[PDB]
């Protein structure tokens, strides 16, 4: 699991987290 | 030491404080996060009531049931 | 049994014509035969095996295991040797390491701490030896201190005649190979260090190869 | 694959230096010479030694062989080395000399020798190889 793709996965997951957060705020 | 002036004691001293927080053993003794995570609260011993008797497996190279108690 | 010298320096020693190996140290001659040493120090030389270290190489079928022995020798006043020999069997490694230890014996300068009363006991000054990552420092110490050091550089010092010394070791000292011969490096350069009591201009002595040329021509060619 | 091993070549090279005079040029006679002069424990390497000895003869006849020294050939090596001419190659009535060393000799007490001839130095300092 090369770090470039791991970082890309992390960014997508973080974007989903953020969206789900202002959906609730 | 890198800076070697006569009037650089504030520089040298305030650089120790910052870099001591990257010491793992210093980090946990001087923060309250480690003390509040301790079940004992910082004591050497503690008393409790037995809830149940349980046995755990050991680990990969070993093979034995470790007799434990949930307290 | 009887020793037949093949070196020029060996013939002179056996003919009882060099007064001491202290004379041949003065001219930095290469002692290439093991029998000059025990001729001069044979009764007073004690040997001690530092350890046995089984290195091994991996071949097509299994591993080839050879045992390596560190041996330290020296009379208990002024001489220390350290030899290393690797061989397929432990007994031969020890015998071959003592032979290598005898050829490498170097004399030890020992001086005074504070005032100069009695026999010299300490290192003359602060000396440092290095090999690999090991840095070893010997600091002069007062009389009766004893040797304060790790166990393995301590036994080298007790067979040097140095009876008190402060030490300090840096690096991976658990590597006994480097850590043994980093102490022996610091011991070696205790004559290489020029002290204000060595400022007298040297009066040259005429060399044994030149002094004893006539017996040399006759006895063997 | 008829390559002669060391135990044949070494034996032949020893025989040739110690018995050069007795050996010949044919295989059959010096095969008998080798048989009687050395104890060779079987016929096959006796023939292979004798065969190599015969082969070495022709090389020796044409000229020297590096690994082996027969008595005759160096006797004329030292005769060649001892040779000396009648007039010296270092004795000339004209020694060709360029200007600059004449000043180098002038600084020496040898300001003017008897038989020094000065030449004109080469004009154009083109003494390097072209870079490429």
């Amino acid at each position: 699991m090369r770090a470039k793709w791991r970082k890309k996965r992390m960014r997508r997951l973080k974007r989903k987290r953020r969206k789900m957060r202002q959906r609730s705020k | 030491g890198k800076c070697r002036g006569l009037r650089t004691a504030r520089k040298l001293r305030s650089h120790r404080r910052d870099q001591k927080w990257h010491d793992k053993q210093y980090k946990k003794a001087h923060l309250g996060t480690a003390l509040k995570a301790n079940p004992f609260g910082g004591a050497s011993h503690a008393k409790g009531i037995v809830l149940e008797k349980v046995g755990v497996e050991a680990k990969q190279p070993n093979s034995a049931i470790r007799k434990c108690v949930r307290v | 049994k009887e020793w037949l010298p093949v070196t020029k320096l060996g013939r002179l020693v056996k003919d009882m014509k060099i007064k001491s190996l202290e004379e041949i140290y003065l001219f930095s001659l290469p002692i290439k035969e093991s029998e000059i040493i025990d001729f001069f120090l044979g009764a007073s030389l004690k040997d001690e095996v530092l350890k046995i270290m089984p290195v091994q190489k991996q071949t097509r079928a299994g591993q080839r295991t050879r045992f390596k022995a560190f041996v330290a020798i020296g009379d208990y006043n002024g001489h220390v040797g350290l030899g290393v020999k690797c061989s397929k069997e432990v007994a031969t490694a020890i015998r071959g390491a003592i032979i290598l230890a005898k050829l490498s014996i170097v004399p030890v300068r020992r001086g005074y701490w504070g005032n100069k009363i009695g026999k010299p006991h300490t290192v003359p000054c602060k000396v440092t030896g290095r090999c690999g990552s090991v840095l070893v420092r010997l600091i002069p110490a007062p009389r009766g201190t004893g040797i304060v050091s790790a166990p393995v550089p301590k036994k080298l010092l007790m067979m040097a005649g140095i009876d008190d010394c402060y030490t300090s070791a840096r690096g991976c000292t658990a590597t006994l190979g480097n850590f043994a011969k980093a102490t022996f490096d610091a011991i070696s350069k205790t004559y290489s260090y020029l002290t204000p009591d060595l400022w007298k201009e040297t009066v040259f002595t005429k060399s044994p190869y030149q002094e004893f040329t006539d017996h040399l021509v006759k006895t063997h060619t | 694959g008829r390559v002669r091993t060391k135990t044949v070549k070494k034996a032949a090279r020893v025989i040739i230096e110690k018995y050069y005079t007795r050996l010949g040029n044919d295989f059959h006679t010096n095969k008998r010479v080798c048989e009687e002069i050395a104890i060779i424990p079987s016929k096959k390497l006796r023939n292979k030694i004798a065969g190599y000895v015969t082969h070495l003869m022709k090389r020796i006849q044409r000229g020297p062989v590096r690994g082996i020294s027969i008595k005759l050939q160096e006797e004329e090596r030292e005769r060649r080395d001892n040779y000396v001419p009648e007039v010296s190659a270092l004795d000339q009535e004209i020694i060709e000399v360029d200007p600059d060393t004449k000043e180098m000799l002038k600084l020496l007490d040898f300001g003017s020798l008897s038989n020094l001839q000065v030449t004109q130095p080469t004009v154009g300092m083109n003494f390097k190889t072209p870079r490429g």
Partner: protein, 129 residues
């Protein structure tokens, strides 16, 4: 930029003594350098030297012997009392028989053994042996 001329002078002497030369050229000159070598002179560690006088900070050419092991400078110039002097010489001298700490006092630039002999503290400059 150049900050401590005495630090450059002693580093230059130490490199040329370490490589076995016979003379060293010290590019900047000052009273502190000239007074420091005269202390090393009196104890036989260096030979006699010579300062060249251009109308700027002069140069110095110093004759070397084979007796110098190391000359050095301590930065910054700490102040040292008579109580601290035994600890300083315990740190940066090889043995108790030879080696010197040069330290300036109100009595002048002068080494440690006799600075104790007239009971004056001072500021540490360097050491040699």
């Amino acid at each position: 930029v150049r900050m401590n001329v005495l630090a450059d002078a002693l580093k230059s002497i130490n490199n040329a003594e370490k490589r076995g030369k016979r003379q060293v050229l010290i590019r900047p000159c000052s009273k502190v350098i000239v007074r420091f070598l005269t202390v090393m002179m009196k104890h036989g560690y260096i030979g006699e030297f010579e300062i060249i006088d251009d109308h700027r900070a002069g140069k110095i050419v110093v004759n070397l012997t084979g007796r110098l092991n190391k000359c050095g400078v301590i930065s910054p110039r700490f102040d040292v009392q008579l109580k601290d002097l035994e600890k300083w010489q315990n740190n940066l001298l090889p043995s108790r028989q030879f080696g010197f700490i040069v330290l300036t006092t109100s009595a002048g630039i002068m080494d440690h053994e006799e600075a104790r002999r007239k009971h004056t503290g001072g500021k540490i400059l360097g050491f040699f042996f």
